[PDB]
């Protein structure tokens, strides 16, 4: 009922470079074996034990954050429905420990081997221990995304992440057919351990701000194949030309015609003349010529008959006597050097090479699976094959162009900006202050002063409360986009001035004030004070920045213009503590609907003598703002009465004028779920949350005229995406009974068990539909036997007074995709200081860290 506090320890999660995912076709082997071994463990310290769970993760919106988590403490692995972990005793899937009955119920003892078996094709996940198969299997879990071998080690523990390498051997024998993280896994970058979603990475000078990294998304490993006698003659001539070209290059390299096949003698038997050309050779030569012609004509622009005069031009080069083969041919090509042009030709070459590799993977990976190195398109393999294919296609198009031719080629953002600002107590009303910022790369950066009351989910510049200056092309951003000055370079720092005496803002890059088009000290036209000013920094995806607020003389780098030359002072001259900064969190959390909102309006419309008062929605008929659907729920929670014959009650069964079969029951023991409202706006009605029932059960009512809606409970925590969120489950836990029979199952952890909205209607929706999901049935008094409504078992006081009352506390809360959060001023002081050695990337932490925080009883948040 009231607010309570407790200490807790931060949780951390490391992530390797191995990427595993599933797609609709050839993506990976699907059988990977990994092992994790622990050297040193620390017993119960401070308040709780050493939290450490191991398992797999996902990249579809899963992003742990230290400090603020789900439920109690930090969001460890397995707390949510997007990741899976195991501490060695009980499975953690949805912040609920799952008891198991397995031989060897022991904690993570020192010098122990821990492994888990993951199957990508068969939906089953099974763990393992040193000397026993771990009981417990998975079934029908999430597949889309990328699987990572994540760990959930806390402060004060040492673990070794031993996959493979110089000393990467497995103590226990791997199952057959499972890849032990080898066979050319990511042959472009070294294997390193990095935290997930870094934003406070340390540096030689100071902390470095890191934006949202751009990953490989999901289901992208599969390839993407694409689909006249004169033309045939030209194709045949080009095929013969490239044939003699590779023949002459192969002869010059030291390969001649062999008797049948001289592999040890370095002889290639394909070097034969066209007169005695083999029939299969001519067959695949014409096939590849036709394929190249089809790919060339697949574009919207044809080759075109411009002059066709150089087709008859024939030339020859030197023919040394050693270049002749046993066939008797004389491969003398023509010489051309006047075909250089724009690199659009090179782009076409690269695109053609990519298409050829895609179709080769389509017709090659589909069989064998033996000695092909698994295989990915021209985005992750080595650059040698890419360069070879590029030079082959560029010489091919050069040969084509040398014959008188002229060819010319024709969802949730997630990774968005991250607003960085200070606390609302460090406002400035009068006085000059000095601000600095260091850049590393050039991207989507916005640095400048702004109002303290910065609106979230608002682009920096398209508002009256931001005065940042965009880092892409050297243009300002304040209620529009106007050019300001020179663009950025790689490295250096960025200067930002402020003045309160006459309201002038000065921007400098490197010892020089940024000049404007007018040619004077251009400002933002005497910004009115209003409330105050506050330094606000921005960061785009895949960008690294260094915010140097300035705590010492050695911190400042240039300070050429003002700062110290004039009556300016650094922002942190005498702040003995590091300045607290508030970042922008990407986790979609909830907030009450603001009043006087021009788009949405909710009014407590009163009812009648027979209809209790309800809540309606008001929207503009014109589509002034149509972004996506609305995410709505109630205010308080609805617990399930544990134990008292029947441990679990409230049978989940919706009923809309008939008997439906939701088949989504037994969600758990307590399950403090809410009542979600998932719909859109079509006829300015959306939904009407109404409570009206007068019999021995309780149900909610919603009235709509013509729209689509989903009356399915959203659970304790909601983390949706977009596109309507139709048929998006998380997992089903299959409990093992140590046999092959099956006693009980665990069909729970359903955050959103929503089916299609067309189950009730057939063709159209002419009348109103009143969905009445009956989920409230505790007991009924036999003294009156009706003839209990809602707000009776949901509250804590009106338990034995069943009456249709609408308390002034149930307000719908619209889902804010962005929420403000404060990151701690002290992170882990080690953070893998060894950075991974050759013994298996050993990581250890020594300094503990304690943090105490609230816990709202209604919303499981810290």
């Amino acid at each position: 009922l009231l607010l309570q506090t407790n200490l807790i320890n931060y949780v951390t999660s490391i992530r390797p470079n191995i990427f595993v995912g599933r797609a609709e076709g050839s993506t990976q082997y699907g059988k990977w074996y990994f092992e994790v071994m622990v050297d040193e463990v620390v017993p119960f310290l401070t308040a709780q034990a050493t939290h450490l769970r191991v398992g797999w993760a996902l990249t579809e919106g899963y992003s742990p954050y230290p400090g603020g988590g789900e439920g109690w403490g930090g969001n460890g692995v397995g707390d949510d429905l997007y990741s899976y972990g195991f501490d060695g005793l009980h499975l953690w899937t949805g912040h609920v420990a799952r008891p198991v009955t397995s031989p060897g119920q022991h904690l993570l003892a020192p010098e122990d081997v821990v492994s888990c078996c993951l199957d990508l094709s068969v939906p089953s996940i099974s763990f393992r221990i040193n000397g026993c198969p771990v009981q417990g299997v998975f079934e029908a879990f999430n597949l889309d995304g990328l699987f990572f071998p994540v760990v959930s080690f806390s402060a004060g523990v040492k673990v070794r992440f031993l996959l493979g390498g110089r000393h990467g051997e497995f103590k226990f024998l791997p199952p057959p057919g499972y890849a032990p993280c080898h066979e050319a896994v990511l042959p472009r970058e070294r294997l390193r351990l990095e935290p997930i979603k870094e934003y406070r990475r340390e540096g030689p000078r100071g902390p470095h701000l890191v934006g949202p990294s751009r990953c490989l998304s999901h289901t992208d490993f599969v390839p993407c194949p694409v689909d006249p006698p004169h033309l045939e003659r030209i194709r045949e001539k080009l095929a013969e030309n490239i044939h003699e070209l590779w023949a002459l290059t192969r002869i010059e390299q030291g390969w001649t015609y062999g008797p049948v096949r001289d592999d040890n003698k370095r002889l290639h038997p394909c070097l034969v003349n066209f007169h005695s050309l083999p029939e299969p050779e001519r067959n695949y030569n014409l096939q590849m010529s036709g394929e190249t012609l089809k790919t060339l004509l697949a574009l919207g622009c044809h080759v075109g008959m411009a002059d066709e005069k150089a087709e008859d031009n024939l030339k020859k080069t030197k023919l040394p006597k050693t270049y002749m083969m046993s066939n008797g041919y004389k491969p003398a090509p023509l010489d051309l050097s006047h075909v250089r042009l724009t690199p659009a030709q090179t782009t076409l070459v690269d695109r053609l090479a990519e298409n050829g590799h895609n179709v080769w993977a389509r017709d090659r990976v589909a069989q064998g699976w033996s000695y092909s190195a698994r295989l990915v398109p021209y985005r992750l393999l080595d650059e040698a094959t890419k360069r070879s294919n590029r030079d082959s296609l560029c010489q091919a198009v050069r040969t084509l162009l040398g014959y008188g031719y002229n060819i010319e080629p024709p969802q949730s953002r997630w990774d968005r900006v991250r607003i960085f600002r200070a606390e609302k107590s460090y406002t400035v009303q009068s006085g000059r202050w000095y601000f600095e910022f260091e850049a590393v790369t050039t991207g989507e950066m916005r640095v400048g002063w702004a109002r303290p009351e910065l609106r979230p989910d608002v682009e920096l510049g398209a508002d009256e409360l931001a005065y940042v200056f965009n880092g892409h092309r050297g243009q300002r951003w304040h209620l529009g986009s106007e050019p300001f000055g020179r663009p950025w370079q790689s490295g250096d720092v960025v200067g930002c001035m402020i003045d309160l005496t006459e309201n002038t803002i000065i921007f400098t890059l490197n010892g020089e004030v940024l000049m404007s088009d007018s040619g004077s000290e251009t400002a933002f036209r005497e910004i009115e004070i209003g409330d105050g000013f506050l330094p606000v920094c921005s960061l785009g995806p895949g960008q690294v920045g260094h915010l140097n607020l300035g705590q010492d003389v050695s911190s400042l780098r240039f300070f050429a213009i003002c700062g110290l030359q004039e009556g300016f002072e650094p922002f942190a001259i005498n702040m003995q503590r590091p300045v607290t900064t508030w970042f922008s969190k990407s986790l979609p959390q909830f907030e009450p609907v603001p009043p006087e909102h021009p788009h949405y309006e909710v009014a407590r419309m009163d009812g009648t003598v027979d209809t209790p008062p309800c809540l309606r929605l008001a929207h503009r008929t014109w589509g002034s703002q149509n972004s996506l659907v609305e995410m709505l729920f109630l205010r308080l929670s609805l617990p399930v009465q544990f134990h008292q014959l029947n441990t679990t009650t409230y049978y989940y069964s919706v009923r809309v004028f008939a008997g439906q079969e939701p088949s989504c029951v037994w969600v758990g023991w307590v399950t403090p779920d809410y009542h979600q409202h998932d719909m859109n706006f079509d006829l300015s009605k959306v939904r009407a949350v109404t409570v009206t029932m007068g019999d021995e059960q309780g149900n909610v009512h919603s009235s709509l005229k013509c729209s689509n809606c989903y009356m399915v409970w959203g659970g304790d925590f909601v983390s949706p995406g977009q596109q309507g969120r139709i048929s998006h489950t998380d997992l089903v836990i299959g409990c093992l009974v140590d046999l092959a029979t099956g006693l009980m199952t665990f069909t729970a952890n359903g955050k959103e068990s929503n089916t299609f909205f067309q189950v009730e209607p057939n063709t159209k929706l002419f009348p109103a539909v009143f969905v009445l999901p009956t989920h409230q049935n505790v007991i009924q008094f036999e003294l009156g036997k009706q003839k209990m409504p809602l707000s009776a078992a949901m509250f804590l006081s009106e338990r034995k007074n069943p009456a249709p009352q609408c308390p002034p506390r149930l307000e719908v809360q619209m889902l804010m995709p962005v929420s403000w959060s404060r990151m701690p001023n002290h992170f882990l002081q080690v953070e893998t200081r060894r950075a991974g050695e050759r013994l298996g990337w050993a990581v250890q932490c020594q300094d503990p860290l304690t943090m105490m925080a609230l816990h709202i009883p209604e919303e499981n948040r810290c």
């Binding site: 004077s520 003389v553 213009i561 003002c562 110290l564 030359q565 004039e566 002072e569 001259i573 005498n574």
Partner: protein, 111 residues
């Protein structure tokens, strides 16, 4: 059109003003302000020369302000700014000239 911004001398003066901090102490800043207000209060160069050594208490302690320690630290501990003991003949005329030129610039800012 032509205005003050069209003139080059004022722009060059404004550009070169934040350059001479190597001999601009906070005590020197107070002396410059005193010289400027003396010039404003009906005084000439003769009065400035006569009163060039009249004021002595302007060199206040570094602990008198929460930000005065920073100015003293930057004025003392820098290789490019070393001033421990200098004669008054060279640390007063430059300060009063800077005060006079900034007073003239302020007066001519809004003619």
């Amino acid at each position: 059109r032509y205005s003050v911004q069209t003139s080059l001398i004022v722009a060059t003066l404004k550009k070169m003003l934040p350059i001479g901090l190597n001999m601009c102490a906070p005590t020197d800043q107070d002396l410059i302000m005193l010289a400027k207000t003396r010039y404003a209060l009906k005084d000439t160069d003769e009065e400035v020369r006569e009163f060039l050594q009249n004021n002595l208490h302007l060199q206040g302690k570094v602990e008198g302000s929460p930000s005065l320690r920073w100015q003293m630290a930057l004025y003392r501990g820098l290789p490019g700014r070393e001033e421990d003991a200098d004669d008054p003949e060279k640390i007063v005329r430059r300060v009063q000239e800077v005060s006079a030129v900034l007073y003239h610039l302020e007066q001519t800012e809004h003619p």
